[PDB]
Write a protein that binds this DNA or RNA. Structure first.
Ligand SMILES: CN[C@@H]1[C@@H](O)[C@@H](O[C@@H]2[C@@H](O)[C@H](O[C@H]3O[C@H]([C@@H](C)O)[C@@H](O)[C@H](O)[C@H]3N)[C@@H](N)C[C@H]2N)OC[C@]1(C)O
Ligand SMILES: CN[C@@H]1[C@@H](O)[C@@H](O[C@@H]2[C@@H](O)[C@H](O[C@H]3O[C@H]([C@@H](C)O)[C@@H](O)[C@H](O)[C@H]3N)[C@@H](N)C[C@H]2N)OC[C@]1(C)O
Ligand SMILES: CN[C@@H]1[C@@H](O)[C@@H](O[C@@H]2[C@@H](O)[C@H](O[C@H]3O[C@H]([C@@H](C)O)[C@@H](O)[C@H](O)[C@H]3N)[C@@H](N)C[C@H]2N)OC[C@]1(C)O
Ligand SMILES: [Mg+2]
Ligand SMILES: [Mg+2]
Ligand SMILES: [Mg+2]
Ligand SMILES: [Mg+2]
Ligand SMILES: [Mg+2]
Ligand SMILES: [Mg+2]
Ligand SMILES: [Mg+2]
Ligand SMILES: [Mg+2]
Ligand SMILES: [Mg+2]
Ligand SMILES: [Mg+2]
Ligand SMILES: [Mg+2]
Ligand SMILES: [Mg+2]
Ligand SMILES: [Mg+2]
Ligand SMILES: [Mg+2]
Ligand SMILES: [Mg+2]
Ligand SMILES: [Mg+2]
Ligand SMILES: [Mg+2]
Ligand SMILES: [Mg+2]
Ligand SMILES: [Mg+2]
Ligand SMILES: [Mg+2]
Ligand SMILES: [Mg+2]
Ligand SMILES: [Mg+2]
Ligand SMILES: [Mg+2]
Ligand SMILES: [Mg+2]
Ligand SMILES: [Mg+2]
Ligand SMILES: [Mg+2]
Ligand SMILES: [Mg+2]
Ligand SMILES: [Mg+2]
Ligand SMILES: [Mg+2]
Ligand SMILES: [Mg+2]
Ligand SMILES: [Mg+2]
Ligand SMILES: [Mg+2]
Ligand SMILES: [Mg+2]
Ligand SMILES: [Mg+2]
Ligand SMILES: [Mg+2]
Ligand SMILES: [Mg+2]
Ligand SMILES: [Mg+2]
Ligand SMILES: [Mg+2]
Ligand SMILES: [Mg+2]
Ligand SMILES: [Mg+2]
Ligand SMILES: [Mg+2]
Ligand SMILES: [Mg+2]
Ligand SMILES: [Mg+2]
Ligand SMILES: [Mg+2]
Ligand SMILES: [Mg+2]
Ligand SMILES: [Mg+2]
Ligand SMILES: [Mg+2]
Ligand SMILES: [Mg+2]
Ligand SMILES: [Mg+2]
Ligand SMILES: [Mg+2]
Ligand SMILES: [Mg+2]
Ligand SMILES: [Mg+2]
Ligand SMILES: [Mg+2]
Ligand SMILES: [Mg+2]
Ligand SMILES: [Mg+2]
Ligand SMILES: [Mg+2]
Ligand SMILES: [Mg+2]
Ligand SMILES: [Mg+2]
Ligand SMILES: [Mg+2]
Ligand SMILES: [Mg+2]
Ligand SMILES: [Mg+2]
Ligand SMILES: [Mg+2]
Ligand SMILES: [Mg+2]
Ligand SMILES: [Mg+2]
Ligand SMILES: [Mg+2]
Ligand SMILES: [Mg+2]
Ligand SMILES: [Mg+2]
Ligand SMILES: [Mg+2]
Ligand SMILES: [Mg+2]
Ligand SMILES: [Mg+2]
Ligand SMILES: [Mg+2]
Ligand SMILES: [Mg+2]
Ligand SMILES: [Mg+2]
Ligand SMILES: [Mg+2]
Ligand SMILES: [Mg+2]
Ligand SMILES: [Mg+2]
Ligand SMILES: [Mg+2]
Ligand SMILES: [Mg+2]
Ligand SMILES: [Mg+2]
Ligand SMILES: [Mg+2]
Ligand SMILES: [Mg+2]
Ligand SMILES: [Mg+2]
Ligand SMILES: [Mg+2]
Ligand SMILES: [Mg+2]
Ligand SMILES: [Mg+2]
Ligand SMILES: [Mg+2]
Ligand SMILES: [Mg+2]
Ligand SMILES: [Mg+2]
Ligand SMILES: [Mg+2]
Ligand SMILES: [Mg+2]
Ligand SMILES: [Mg+2]
Ligand SMILES: [Mg+2]
Ligand SMILES: [Mg+2]
Ligand SMILES: [Mg+2]
Ligand SMILES: [Mg+2]
Ligand SMILES: [Mg+2]
Ligand SMILES: [Mg+2]
Ligand SMILES: [Mg+2]
Ligand SMILES: [Mg+2]
Ligand SMILES: [Mg+2]
Ligand SMILES: [Mg+2]
Ligand SMILES: [Mg+2]
Ligand SMILES: [Mg+2]
Ligand SMILES: [Mg+2]
Ligand SMILES: [Mg+2]
Ligand SMILES: [Mg+2]
Ligand SMILES: [Mg+2]
Ligand SMILES: [Mg+2]
Ligand SMILES: [Mg+2]
Ligand SMILES: [Mg+2]
Ligand SMILES: [Mg+2]
Ligand SMILES: [Mg+2]
Ligand SMILES: [Mg+2]
Ligand SMILES: [Mg+2]
Ligand SMILES: [Mg+2]
Ligand SMILES: [Mg+2]
Ligand SMILES: [Mg+2]
Ligand SMILES: [Mg+2]
Ligand SMILES: [Mg+2]
Ligand SMILES: [Mg+2]
Ligand SMILES: [Mg+2]
Ligand SMILES: [Mg+2]
Ligand SMILES: [Mg+2]
Ligand SMILES: [Mg+2]
Ligand SMILES: [Mg+2]
Ligand SMILES: [Mg+2]
Ligand SMILES: [Mg+2]
Ligand SMILES: [Mg+2]
Ligand SMILES: [Mg+2]
Ligand SMILES: [Mg+2]
Ligand SMILES: [Mg+2]
Ligand SMILES: [Mg+2]
Ligand SMILES: [Mg+2]
Ligand SMILES: [Mg+2]
Ligand SMILES: [Mg+2]
Ligand SMILES: [Mg+2]
Ligand SMILES: [Mg+2]
Ligand SMILES: [Mg+2]
Ligand SMILES: [Mg+2]
Ligand SMILES: [Mg+2]
Ligand SMILES: [Mg+2]
Ligand SMILES: [Mg+2]
Ligand SMILES: [Mg+2]
Ligand SMILES: [Zn+2]
Ligand SMILES: [Zn+2]
Lengths: 252, 49, 84, 112
RNA sequence: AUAUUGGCGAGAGACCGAUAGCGAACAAGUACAGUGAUGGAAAGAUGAAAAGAACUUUGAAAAGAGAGUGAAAAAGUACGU
RNA sequence: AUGGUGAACUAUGCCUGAAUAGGGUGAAGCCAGAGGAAACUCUGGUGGAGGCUCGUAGCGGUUCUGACGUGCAAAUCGAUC
RNA sequence: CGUGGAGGUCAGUGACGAAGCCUAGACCGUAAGGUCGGGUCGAACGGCCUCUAGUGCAGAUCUUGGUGGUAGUAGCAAAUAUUCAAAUGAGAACUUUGAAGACUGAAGUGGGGAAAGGUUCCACGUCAACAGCAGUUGGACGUGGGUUAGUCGAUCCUAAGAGAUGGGGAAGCUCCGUUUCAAAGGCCUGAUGCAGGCCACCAUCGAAAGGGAAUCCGGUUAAGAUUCCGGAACCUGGAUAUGGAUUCUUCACGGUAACGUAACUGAAUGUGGAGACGUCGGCGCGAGCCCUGGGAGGAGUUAUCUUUUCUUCUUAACAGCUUAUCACCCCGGAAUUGGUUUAUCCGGAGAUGGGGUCUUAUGGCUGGAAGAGGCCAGCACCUUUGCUGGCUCCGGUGCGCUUGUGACGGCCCGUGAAAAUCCACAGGAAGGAAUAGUUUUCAUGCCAGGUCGUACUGAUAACCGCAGCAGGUCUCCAAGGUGAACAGCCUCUAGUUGAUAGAAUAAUGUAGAUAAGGGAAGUCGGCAAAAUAGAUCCGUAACUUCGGGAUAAGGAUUGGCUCUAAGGGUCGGACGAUCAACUUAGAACUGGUACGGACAAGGGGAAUCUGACUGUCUAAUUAAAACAUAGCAUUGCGAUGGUCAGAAAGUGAUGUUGACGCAAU
RNA sequence: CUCUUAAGGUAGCCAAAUGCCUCGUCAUCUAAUUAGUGACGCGCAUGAAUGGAUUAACGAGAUUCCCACUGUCCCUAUCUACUAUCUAGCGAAACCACAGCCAAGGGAACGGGCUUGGCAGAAUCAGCGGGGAAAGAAGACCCUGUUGAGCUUGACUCUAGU
RNA sequence: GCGUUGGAUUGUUCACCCACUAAUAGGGAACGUGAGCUGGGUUUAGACCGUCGUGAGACAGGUUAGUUUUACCCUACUGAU
RNA sequence: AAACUUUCAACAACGGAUCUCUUGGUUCUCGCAUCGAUGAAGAACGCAGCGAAAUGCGAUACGUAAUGUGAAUUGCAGAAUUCCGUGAAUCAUCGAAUCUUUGAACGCACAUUGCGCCCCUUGGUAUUCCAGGGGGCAUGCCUGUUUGAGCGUCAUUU
């Protein structure tokens, strides 16, 4: 057989991301003397819309500590940050929407976004529009913090690792019916070419394992091992369960 | 229109060679040429740039 | 018309003039030429291609330096000049 | 009933190729290439197009006299006036209120 | 001492005799096809010697008819048979 | 089988440009007014939305199973669409 | 028996004619074959005994070449179209010129380009071949001639992308990486290494449509012209001086302000603004075009009519004055809310109003610049075509057309590039007068601007389709009427009038039409054809997701001419004066009852199957009920990861990303 | 009640583009209807995102009727151009064992040819589609070959990855 | 000898009804007749359903879309010299 | 009886068979050891009194020097051409040069005749901007030189 869609994605020819109109990589300030001991102000000068992100960006300027000049950082604008808000960053900063602090510096139940996985990565978790973590507990001895990611799974990460106070703006975005096929087009136009998708059951067996039949049908289990081989994995991969999910979710 | 020199030069060597035999060649001794074999024309054999 | 009406669209040279061998084999978008492999250091050749080989090997050119090297060898590689 | 032709090598209607119909001394109409309009420089504070400043294309700002690059006030062609007016008041009131903050905290250290 | 379908320089053959013999005995890796890698032809012989037919004549010309050259125009550059 | 050469066509993504008669419809926003005890309800404008619509050019290719069927043409021609 | 070649022989045949070819002439053999004569011919060749093999052809849809019958046959019928005379020439249905009929009709058969071609361009010479008739013509043949730039492009910059380098993989050809686990390099000052301060971006290629330093009109050639000639400019880089301004209050005053200006030090180091940007809607306004009144010239018609029909009446970049919506500043303090757009938005965060400041788009006057260009008249007599003169002027009209642009409005889970450049600002290093010092952003003045391209075509003959192929191939310009209108139809300008022709007018056809009575009985099926149609008014069902359905259905009207009524602009203080529009309604008369009169232009109704819809695909037999999609649902993944790529890697896609996310159904 | 299952077809829909029987039966429309539509349902073999049912609007999608309209038809007729046709010039191709009048006979079971008969007279133009089992392509169906490729799977034998 | 029809469903041959009719006999001519037609069925390549198959695919089970070439030769025939 | 059709012949056509040639091909043997940064093979573009090609050569361009031979070259034209002579000639021979644009191709590029840098010199009034002219800057590595870097590390200053 041929090479299926999902294998062909991976050397990334026409599949790589549509990078042109993009405001540049959103990140925190580097983790330096100013944030891990004192605190350091910045001003949000501009909040502005990123192409292929649902989440508005905040352009926040700081003062270079070690030479005379301004340095601009690209911040994921939590809901409520506004043009010309002062923003304070570091261990000893205060608790206000939009300031960033290490994690052992906030109470539990604190609602924070863009958190670092390890301190210094300039932000990892909950960068999506409307997406946040909650600090659920600290272990000061071997300083950690317990936090529930927007998936809901629970993780133990260094209290040093920073986060930004509040939830990301522009939430409720996926609350709206896309409503017609073109609207889908432009959304993925700026994102990548995954779209549209053609069912592997509507092709011939050389285009896909779901190919073939004098009726369209899968004809063998569409749950497929973790251990499958590339070009064996389409359908439900390594699913522990299948079928319509009844009753209530939400782990603990 | 606006052409590379490399092209506008080969164009010149082209035009320069598009000519009938020099008729005096025929008179030479043991001369086996008759006409110009390699003669080209714009509308017939294009040069391939 | 997978034919004629859609040959009416061929205006764009796949290759231009190779610098090294002059062959109009120089692939534009690939910035290399399909005959001698310029710009590769060595000049492209293969053994299944003996007709290509025979086409381009030594002796289809001017042999500008090499010609006389059999003469020069004949003489013991002389320096100076003859007298009278 | 006269028609007209591009005066340059670009048949296409692009931005650089703008064209104007001109009736000459000869009594004939003729094409003329316009440059793309100039857009007034803007305030580096509020983003306002700033008044008094002459409006050209960028290297046309190296052929012209220094007095139409600015007006007379400090921060002449940078900011929009009322925005210089602002950064003055804020500058004064915050260096004043900076004095007020110094002597209240020298009274917090001794009076403790 | 052994190797040698390359290079340079030599002697040969119960070999081939221009549809043969190397694809090419010729301005042959030519002309030409192809985007390209590549592919890839046809095509030798007037006569000892041009002596390549002065001159007249019909024709607008090409030519034709005479004449002429030559051992031979039953060799006239469409040329040996 | 091995080693090569193609995205001038065509498929799809990216970068940068260019292009698209005249009509039908009349969405939010808004202005005036009318009924009613109230809650509320009507009326006339205004505005100009829509992968809206008649329909050129554009792009397409439905039918004649029309022409052609050693063609104009190795896919074209007309009408209809 | 025969053929190519070899050893031996016949001192074999031959230019007094070898070999080969031709010959219903002669002879030997059963035969394969052999011999001879005659013809043609020119240079070598044969018998015998042996040797050797690329050794004998009717075929293999055999290979290469050559030739017939078909056959003077199929054919040379799309793109409305040709005619008369003369010139030339051996020759004219076809070339030139003159006259006539027409066409393309500004969505071109016109005027230019991009790709591509590459001399086609133009002149002369010319007709063997080519131009599926012809050829005196050509895009053919032959000989020449031709493409002029500081300003038009290229060069520069960056985009997707490509790609050296310390490196890392790979036996290797080489793979990987462009910031890359690197000792990466410069620049301005001076006191040529030196003192210094820095700044440290680590290549490069990648746009003749993106960005960008700067030229216009007139004239000129056979062919080039935004390039040449004439005048009139602007820029960039170098040079420097004179005037002007500035200073004894050293780095200018004025203005409350917004701002002014002829100027009016500035090192980094920083910062800010142009470069720099979607799309649609309506409103304003500019420019060109369109229409049109008066007049000054030329042209046409004039039996009759027309103060008539046609046409000339122009103003470049550049420089000065001036000119604008927007946004401002000052005065003043609002309910009785006012102001305001076609479009509801503005005001105590300072409106309405009085008064000012600015951008200089764009217009106005002048300079340029009439001396140009355009239209006329009178000369003068072959000698050239010179020379003289004249007029070139004043207005109007708008839902007009095109194109620019402004101020706004709709739109988005789409919010619509980057770099090289140019400027400013903050800033206060350093350098500066009084016996004279500072001033290249005010004026004027000097030198320099290379290199490659530039002809023409741009297509029913200059490109690709084997070709002068009814195909394919990017774009700018765009007049008059009718009309909703770049429709269709007719026309002005320019450009064609090319396509083998002549004579007929059988069958059958291709292409276009009409039919009495019937009205789908034809047939797989109304295939095909007919019927319908524009606009104003009236009328308008089942169902419905309340948006639709819907032009549902179904009716009536429509010409021309002659009247009425309604609808606006500008002034000076229920009015009056005046200027300038075609729209709509209405009414009379009128006709062989005709009037969307050519053109243009829906057939409709009830249902079943089926896909929701817009969209997509099998180029070249399948447009569908297939695919896609919005919606629904399921799976995997918290990066030390899921999915995927790779021979490997200090490798890579999602990833400028993090569950409102990426990946798989 | 009984045998049996992991569970024994639920809600729905139906002779449906899913029904063999089959032109199912009844109804309806017609003069007449293997068609359409409405019903019925032990449904060969209907049926729940292998999606079931329903559905406004849409559609160059398959089907049925009706009105209008018609040369679709009864049934043909007439006109216009361009052809064909004759002329000058220009001038191919397919195809071709040899060739070309029948009947019947026999024959490899359908002859232009052989056999026995009918018969038979130059050179020809325009048509035509009976024959040349016409031409077009070493049958694409079918078989055979110890010949293949595309594709599939608990076929043999392996293999990247993991 | 001579005539043996017009329609409804059906691609159909067949079947079956309606109607007129003197009558609506049966058959042959390569199951006459596709370089005469048509292309509705069958019988490729798209697609739906049902049954079968783990699957590719199968189904003599139901559906829908699906390019109909050439005569100028000989003869034959029709007319013409 | 012509025409027509066939068959034979002669002449004429058409075509290139035969025969004879042979500066070519083929094979066998013998001898020889020589490309390149001292820019190779190859490439493009040029060079002639009159050439389109082949061959030859490079802005000294069918060629320059040098050596040998000893009068040609030739298609025409042409030579203060100079023949008992440092001398014809497209002769042979080759020991000295030239050698455009390139090319492993080397300053950077290269669909460009596109853009730098450094030294000498000349000219514009010029260390600096413009121009002309000559001469130069690729990479990996070895030997060596000079300048450097690191609490890697040893001494020595008070
Ligand atoms: C001794 N072992 C380590 C060795 O494992 C390796 O570590 C690299 C480290 O150098 C890289 O780190 C470096 O290189 C990366 C690079 C990927 O761009 C840079 O982003 C990063 O800033 C830089 N410090 C790190 N990002 C990856 C480690 N495996 O190289 C560093 C080292 C110290 O030699
Ligand atoms: C088994 N079928 C093959 C097959 O090749 C067939 O005909 C093909 C045909 O199927 C191909 O193409 C086919 O499919 C394309 C498709 C793109 O729509 C169609 O354009 C085309 O009409 C159709 N015949 C055609 N390009 C070549 C023929 N030899 O029939 C002949 C055959 C060789 O036996
Ligand atoms: C369909 N083709 C046939 C063809 O076969 C051919 O042959 C027939 C042949 O079939 C007849 O032959 C027949 O006649 C005999 C009987 C008459 O003795 C029967 O018994 C016998 O079955 C049968 N074969 C013969 N009598 C006439 C031919 N022309 O010629 C006549 C025809 C009609 O064209
Ligand atoms: Mg594969
Ligand atoms: Mg990317
Ligand atoms: Mg896609
Ligand atoms: Mg989906
Ligand atoms: Mg899908
Ligand atoms: Mg499919
Ligand atoms: Mg598979
Ligand atoms: Mg599977
Ligand atoms: Mg399947
Ligand atoms: Mg299927
Ligand atoms: Mg399915
Ligand atoms: Mg399905
Ligand atoms: Mg199953
Ligand atoms: Mg000779
Ligand atoms: Mg001779
Ligand atoms: Mg060609
Ligand atoms: Mg070609
Ligand atoms: Mg080319
Ligand atoms: Mg294309
Ligand atoms: Mg390409
Ligand atoms: Mg070639
Ligand atoms: Mg070869
Ligand atoms: Mg020696
Ligand atoms: Mg436009
Ligand atoms: Mg040969
Ligand atoms: Mg040969
Ligand atoms: Mg000879
Ligand atoms: Mg001779
Ligand atoms: Mg003779
Ligand atoms: Mg004689
Ligand atoms: Mg003879
Ligand atoms: Mg002779
Ligand atoms: Mg001959
Ligand atoms: Mg002869
Ligand atoms: Mg392409
Ligand atoms: Mg009221
Ligand atoms: Mg639409
Ligand atoms: Mg529509
Ligand atoms: Mg189709
Ligand atoms: Mg057809
Ligand atoms: Mg035909
Ligand atoms: Mg032999
Ligand atoms: Mg003889
Ligand atoms: Mg002889
Ligand atoms: Mg043999
Ligand atoms: Mg033979
Ligand atoms: Mg033979
Ligand atoms: Mg035989
Ligand atoms: Mg012939
Ligand atoms: Mg003839
Ligand atoms: Mg004829
Ligand atoms: Mg004829
Ligand atoms: Mg025809
Ligand atoms: Mg005449
Ligand atoms: Mg003519
Ligand atoms: Mg007309
Ligand atoms: Mg032109
Ligand atoms: Mg042109
Ligand atoms: Mg001709
Ligand atoms: Mg220039
Ligand atoms: Mg560049
Ligand atoms: Mg690389
Ligand atoms: Mg490297
Ligand atoms: Mg390396
Ligand atoms: Mg440009
Ligand atoms: Mg210009
Ligand atoms: Mg000239
Ligand atoms: Mg842009
Ligand atoms: Mg009169
Ligand atoms: Mg200008
Ligand atoms: Mg006001
Ligand atoms: Mg007006
Ligand atoms: Mg030009
Ligand atoms: Mg041109
Ligand atoms: Mg054009
Ligand atoms: Mg061509
Ligand atoms: Mg009108
Ligand atoms: Mg019109
Ligand atoms: Mg015609
Ligand atoms: Mg008629
Ligand atoms: Mg009728
Ligand atoms: Mg009637
Ligand atoms: Mg009726
Ligand atoms: Mg019917
Ligand atoms: Mg129809
Ligand atoms: Mg309605
Ligand atoms: Mg109606
Ligand atoms: Mg007026
Ligand atoms: Mg009346
Ligand atoms: Mg659909
Ligand atoms: Mg198709
Ligand atoms: Mg749903
Ligand atoms: Mg049924
Ligand atoms: Mg149903
Ligand atoms: Mg039913
Ligand atoms: Mg029924
Ligand atoms: Mg019926
Ligand atoms: Mg059922
Ligand atoms: Mg049953
Ligand atoms: Mg079932
Ligand atoms: Mg089921
Ligand atoms: Mg279920
Ligand atoms: Mg089922
Ligand atoms: Mg359903
Ligand atoms: Mg559709
Ligand atoms: Mg449809
Ligand atoms: Mg149905
Ligand atoms: Mg005929
Ligand atoms: Mg004729
Ligand atoms: Mg025949
Ligand atoms: Mg008999
Ligand atoms: Mg018989
Ligand atoms: Mg018979
Ligand atoms: Mg026969
Ligand atoms: Mg016999
Ligand atoms: Mg027949
Ligand atoms: Mg035939
Ligand atoms: Mg076969
Ligand atoms: Mg077979
Ligand atoms: Mg066997
Ligand atoms: Mg196999
Ligand atoms: Mg296959
Ligand atoms: Mg039978
Ligand atoms: Mg039959
Ligand atoms: Mg037949
Ligand atoms: Mg047929
Ligand atoms: Mg059929
Ligand atoms: Mg069918
Ligand atoms: Mg196929
Ligand atoms: Mg269809
Ligand atoms: Mg005929
Ligand atoms: Mg006789
Ligand atoms: Mg010879
Ligand atoms: Mg060299
Ligand atoms: Mg020579
Ligand atoms: Mg000498
Ligand atoms: Mg020599
Ligand atoms: Mg010698
Ligand atoms: Mg030299
Ligand atoms: Mg150049
Ligand atoms: Mg270049
Ligand atoms: Mg100097
Ligand atoms: Mg310089
Ligand atoms: Zn090359
Ligand atoms: Zn401001």
């Amino acid at each position: 057989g041929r090479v299926i869609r999902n294998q062909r994605k991976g050397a990334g020819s026409i599949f790589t991301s549509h990078t042109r109109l993009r405001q540049g990589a959103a990140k925190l300030r580097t983790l330096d003397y100013a944030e891990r001991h004192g605190y350091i102000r910045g001003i949000v000068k501009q909040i502005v819309h990123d192409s292929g992100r649902g989440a508005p960006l905040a352009k926040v300027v700081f003062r270079d500590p070690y030479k005379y000049r301004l340095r601009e950082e690209i911040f994921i604008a939590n809901e409520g940050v506004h043009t010309g808000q002062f923003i304070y960053a570091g261990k000893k900063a205060s608790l206000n929407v939009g300031n960033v602090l290490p994690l052992g510096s906030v109470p539990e139940g604190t609602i924070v976004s863009n958190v670092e996985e390890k301190p210094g990565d300039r932000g990892a978790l909950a960068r999506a529009s409307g997406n946040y973590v909650i600090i659920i507990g600290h272990n000061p001895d071997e300083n950690k913090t317990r936090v529930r990611l927007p998936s809901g799974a629970k993780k133990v990460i260094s209290s040093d690792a920073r986060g930004v106070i509040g939830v990301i703006a522009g939430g409720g975005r996926v609350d709206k019916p896309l409503l017609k096929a073109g609207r889908a087009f432009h959304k993925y136009r700026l994102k990548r070419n995954s779209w549209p998708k053609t069912r592997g059951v509507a092709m011939n067996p050389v285009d896909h394992p779901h190919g073939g039949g004098n009726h369209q049908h899968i004809g063998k289990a569409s749950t497929i091992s973790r251990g499958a081989v590339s070009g064996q994995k389409a359908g439900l991969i390594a699913a522990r369960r299948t079928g319509l999910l009844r009753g209530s979710q939400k782990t603990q | 229109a606006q052409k590379s020199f490399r092209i506008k030069q080969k164009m010149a060597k082209a035009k320069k060679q598009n000519r009938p035999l020099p008729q005096w060649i025929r008179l030479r001794t043991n001369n086996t040429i008759r006409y110009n074999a390699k003669r080209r024309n714009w509308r017939r054999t294009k040069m391939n740039i | 018309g997978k034919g004629t009406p859609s040959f009416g669209k061929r205006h764009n040279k796949s290759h231009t003039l190779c610098n090294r061998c002059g062959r109009r084999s120089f692939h534009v978008q690939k910035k290399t030429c399909s005959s001698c492999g310029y710009p590769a250091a060595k000049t492209r050749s293969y053994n299944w291609g003996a007709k290509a080989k025979r086409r381009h090997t030594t002796g289809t050119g001017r042999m500008r330096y090499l010609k006389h090297v059999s003469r020069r060898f004949k003489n013991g590689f002389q320096t100076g000049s003859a007298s009278k | 009933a006269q028609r007209v032709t591009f005066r340059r090598r670009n048949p296409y209607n692009t931005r650089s190729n703008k064209i104007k119909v001109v009736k000459t001394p000869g009594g004939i109409l003729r094409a003329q290439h316009v440059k793309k309009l100039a857009t007034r420089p803007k305030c580096g504070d509020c983003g306002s197009a700033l008044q008094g400043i002459s409006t050209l294309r960028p290297r046309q700002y190296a052929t012209v006299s220094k007095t139409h690059k600015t007006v007379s006030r400090a921060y002449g062609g940078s900011r929009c006036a009322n925005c210089v007016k602002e950064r003055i008041i804020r500058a004064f009131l915050i260096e004043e209120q900076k004095i007020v903050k110094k002597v209240v905290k020298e009274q917090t250290e001794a009076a403790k």
